[PDB]
Amino acid sequence: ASSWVMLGLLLSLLNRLSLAAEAYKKAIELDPNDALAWLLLGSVLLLLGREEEAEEAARKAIELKPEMDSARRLEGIIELIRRAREAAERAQEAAERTGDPRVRELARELKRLAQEAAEEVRRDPDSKDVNEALKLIVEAIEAAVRALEAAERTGDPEVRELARELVRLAVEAAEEVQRNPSSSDVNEALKLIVEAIDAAVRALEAAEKTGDPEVRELARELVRLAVEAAEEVQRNPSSEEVNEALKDIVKAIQEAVESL
Amino acid sequence: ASSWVMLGLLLSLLNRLSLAAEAYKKAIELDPNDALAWLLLGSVLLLLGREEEAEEAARKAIELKPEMDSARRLEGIIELIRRAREAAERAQEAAERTGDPRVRELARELKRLAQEAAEEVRRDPDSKDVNEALKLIVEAIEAAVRALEAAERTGDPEVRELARELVRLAVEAAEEVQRNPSSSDVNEALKLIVEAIDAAVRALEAAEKTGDPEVRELARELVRLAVEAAEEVQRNPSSEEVNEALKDIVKAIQEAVESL
Amino acid sequence: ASSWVMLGLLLSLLNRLSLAAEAYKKAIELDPNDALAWLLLGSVLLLLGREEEAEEAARKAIELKPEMDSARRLEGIIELIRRAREAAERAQEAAERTGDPRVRELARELKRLAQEAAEEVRRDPDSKDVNEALKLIVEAIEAAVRALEAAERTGDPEVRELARELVRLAVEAAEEVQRNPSSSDVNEALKLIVEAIDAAVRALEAAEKTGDPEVRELARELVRLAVEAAEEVQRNPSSEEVNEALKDIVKAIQEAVESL
Amino acid sequence: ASSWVMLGLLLSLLNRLSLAAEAYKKAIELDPNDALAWLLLGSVLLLLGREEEAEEAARKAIELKPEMDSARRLEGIIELIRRAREAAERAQEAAERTGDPRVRELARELKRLAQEAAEEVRRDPDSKDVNEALKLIVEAIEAAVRALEAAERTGDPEVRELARELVRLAVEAAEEVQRNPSSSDVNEALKLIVEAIDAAVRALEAAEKTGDPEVRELARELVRLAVEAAEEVQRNPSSEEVNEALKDIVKAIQEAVESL
C-alpha cells in the first residue's frame, strides 16, 4: 500500500509530477482508505493544472479524515487559486471594457503576478508564510477589481486616473510581498495598504452615490492623500511612523464616510 | 518488484545514474511486465549517453503499454536528440566544405548549444516547456543546415555572407530561447524567426533557380530587410509591433516567391 | 516498520514536515523500539516549533540507545536553542530596562541572528561546523547579556556606551560567523573576540566593585583599546599579527584583573 | 535486505551521513552478499573522513563483484585522495625546509584547493568530469612537489624563484580547472601546463646534474620562456595558437634535454 505512495513521492522529487500522480492513483487503487495518498495526489495534481481532480482528491481526503488540517490547507489553496483566477478574469474584462492600454497592461501584470504566487504556493503548500502572502494578494486583487467596477460605474476621467494610481500601487505592493514573502514588515505594509484601498473604494463609492461637487472634490482629496501616503509607506515599509500615518489616514476616511 | 524501482529512483536522486540504471535492469529482470520500470530505465539511460539502450527501453515501454504518453514523450525526445545530432554533423560538414572559420565556429557554438539544450531536456523530460523549446531549436538548426546547403549550391560571396548573417541571428535566437525557456514572448519570437528563415531560404533558392540579376538583387533585398527586422525583433521580443512587422515581411516574401 | 520511516523521510524531502512527523509517529506506533524513528521524529519536530516534543523524542532515543551520539547531538542542539532563547529574552529585558533605542534595536537584531542560526542548524543538524558556530554564537549572546547586566548594575553613561560598543562588535562578529560558518579564520576570530569580551566584562565588574576613579579610568582605557583591537581583528580576521595582538591584550587584561 | 539500503540512501539525501553509514552497516549485517550495500557504505564513509573504512568497503565490494567498475571508481578515488594528501604533506615539508613564507602560503593554498576538489569528488563520485579534473590536479601537485625537491637539491636563489613561479602558475591553473571542471578548453590547458612543468623540471634537473654556467643559463632561459608562455596560455586558454606555441616549446625543451 504505502510502497506506491513512496514511489509517487520519489517520482515527485525527480520533477516527474505526472508519473507521481499516476503512482498515487495506483496506491489509492490498492487501498482507498489512505488519506495521505489522496492528500499527496491532490497536492501534486494542483501542480499539473487539473484543479478539478485536485479538488476532488482534497474532498476525498477531508471526508476520509476530517482532522487532517493539511487537507483543508490545500482545499483552501485551491479555493484561493480559483478565486484569484476569477478576480483576474474580472480585471481583464473591466480593463477591456475601459479600453485603456495602461489599465490593460496593469491587469495583465497583475494576472502574471497572481499566477507566479500561485505556482509558488503550489510548490510549497504547507508554508503558512506564502499561504497568508497569497491571501493578502488575493484580497489585493479583489480590492483592485472592486476599484475597477467602481471606476466603470463612475465614468469620470479624474476618478479613472485615481483608480489607475490605486491599482498601480496595489500591484506594486503585491509584487513586493511576492518577492519578499517571509518579511513581516512588508506583510504589515500590505495589510495596511489593502485596508487603505478598501477605505478608498468605500469612500469614492459613497461620494459617487451622493453626487455633489463638494463631496466629490473631498473624495478626490482623500484618495490623493491616500495614494501619496501609500506610495510613501511602500517605499519605506519599515517605518512605524508612516505606518501610524496610514492608520490615522484610514481612520479619518472611515470617520468621514460614516459621517456623510 | 517495485522495491528495486524505488532503489533505482533513490540512486538517481543521488546522481548515481549508472547504479540507477542497473537497479532498473534488475527490477525489470524481477518482473518485465513493469512499463514504469522500462520507462524510468530509458529516461536514466538517456542521461548516460547510451541512446540506443534508451530507445530500446522506450520501445519496450510503448509496446507494453501504448496509452503511456510519457513513454512516447521520451521516445520523441530521443528522436529529436538524434535529429539534432544529425543536423549538427551536417552543419559541421557544410562549414568544413566552405572552409570559412566564421561559419565553422558558428556551427561549433550551435552544436554546443544543441547539446546543452539536450542535456537540459534529459534532466527534465516531462516539461513540455523545454520539450517545445528544443523543438523550435531543432527546426532552427534544420533551417540553418538548409541555408548552409543552399549557400554551398549557390557559391556566391554575397549569398554566403547573407547565409552567415541568417545563421548568426538563428543561433542568437536559439541561445536566447535556451536561456529563457519558460517565456512565451521569446517562444513566439523564435517561431516567427524560424518562419522568416524558412521563407528566406525558399526565396533565395527560387532566385538561384531562376538565375537573373534583377531577381537575384530582389532576393538580396528581401533577405537583407529580413535580417534587419529579425535582429530588431530579437533585440525587442516583447513588441507586438515588430512581431506584426516580421509577419508582414514573411507574408510579402511568400507572395513574391509564389508570384515568381 | 521501516516502511513508514522511509515514508516520513520522503515527506520531509518534499518539505512536508508535518506529514513527516505524523508518519514518524505512526512508525513508532508500529514499533516503539526504533531509535532511528524517535531520532528522526525529534529532528523534524525541531523544525516545526514544538521544541518540547522534539526534546521528548530525543530523550526517548537516548534512553533506548545511549551509544547514538546523533541523538545526543540534537539533544544538545535543543538545549542550545533554549539557552539562546533565554539569552535573547534576557537581552530584551535588559534593553527595555535601559530604555535606549540603540541597545533595543541591537538586541532585536541579535535575536534575529540567533533565530536565523537556529533555523540553519535545524536544517543541518549533523554538521559539526554550524553546531560549533552556533556554540560560539550562544556564548557570544551570553557574554552580551552579562555585559548588559553589568552595565545596568553600573549605571554610568561612559560604561553604558562602552557596553554598547562591545555588544555592537559582538553582534557584528556573530553575523560574520553566521554568514561564513565553514571558515576557520573567522572561527578563531570569534573565539578570540568572545574571550576578549569575557575579559572585558570581568575587568569592568572588578573596577566597579573597587569603585575608585583611577581604576575606573584604567578600566575604561583597557576596554577602549579592547574595542579598538576587536574592530581591527574583525575587519582583518586572517591576520595572525592582530590575532596575537588581541591575545596579548587579553593576557594583559587578565594580569591586571588578577593583580588588582 | 534492500529496505535498509533504501533507508541509508534516504538518510544520505537528508545530509545525515552518519546515520546513513549506520543503516548501510545494518543492511550489510542483514545480508553481506550485497555489493551495492558495501559500495554505498564506502561512498558515504568517504565523506565522513574515515578513509580506512571506505577503502575496506571498496575492497569488499570489489572482491564480492569484480565487474562493478563504480567500486573500482571510488577505489581509485580513495587512492587519489591519499596520494593528494601525501603530496600535500610533502609540499608542506619542503616549504618548511625552505622557510620561505611565500612558498609556505602557496603550499597552504594548494592543500586547501586539493581538499576542496577532494570534497567535490566525494560529493559527486560517479562524474568522470571531476574525476579526471582531480587527476590532472594530483599530477599537478606531484609535479609541484617534484619542483620543490629539485629546488631544495639545487639551493640557488635563481632556480628557487623559478620554482616559485612554476608552482604559482601550477596552483593558478589548478584553481582554474577546479572552478571550471566541465570545460574541455581548460582541461587541455591544464594537460599542456602539467606537461610543460614536467619538461621544465626534467630540464632543470639535467642542468643541475651537468653543472655548467652556460647550460644553467640556457636552462634558466627555457624555464623563463616556459613560465611566460604558461601564464599566457593560462590567461588565454581558448587559443589554439598559444596551445600549439606551448606544444612547440615543450617539444624544444624535450629535444634540448635529450641532446644534452
Residue numbers in the entry:
A (entry chain C), B (entry chain B), C (entry chain D), D (entry chain A): 1 to 260
Task: Kindly provide excerpts from the paper associated with this entry.
We develop a hierarchical approach to designing multi-component protein assemblies from two classes of modular building blocks: designed helical repeat proteins (DHRs) and helical bundle oligomers (HBs). We first rigidly fuse DHRs to HBs to generate a large library of oligomeric building blocks. We then generate assemblies with cyclic, dihedral, and point group symmetries from these building blocks using architecture guided rigid helical fusion with new software named WORMS. X-ray crystallography and cryo-electron microscopy characterization show that the hierarchical design approach can accurately generate a wide range of assemblies, including a 43 nm diameter icosahedral nanocage.
The second protocol simplifies the process by overlapping the helical termini of the DHRs and HBs and designing only the immediate residues around the junction (HelixFuse, HF). For the second approach, HelixFuse (HF), the same set of DHRs and HBs were combinatorially fused together by overlapping the terminal helix residues in both directions (“AB”: c-terminus of HB to n-terminus of DHR, “BA”: n-terminus of HB to c-terminus of DHR). Sixteen tpr1C4_pm3 fusions were tested, 14 found to be soluble, and 10 displayed monodispersed peaks by SEC. C4_nat_HF-7900 was found to form monodisperse particles by cryo EM, with the 3D reconstruction modeled to 3.7 Å resolution. Inset shows the correct placement of the rotamers in the designed junction region. d C4_nat_HF-7900; design model (purple/grey) and cryo-EM map (yellow/white), with insert highlighting the the high resolution (~3.8 Å) density. e C5_HF-3921 as characterized by cryo-EM, with inset showing density surrounding the designed junction. f C5_HF-2101, g C5_HF-0019, h C6_HF-0075, and i C6_HF-0080 all showed a good overall match to its negative-stain EM 2D class averages (top) from one direction, using a predicted projection map (bottom). We show that it is possible to genetically fuse DHR “adapters” to natural proteins; these proteins can then be used in larger assemblies through WORMS with less likelihood of disrupting the original protein fold.
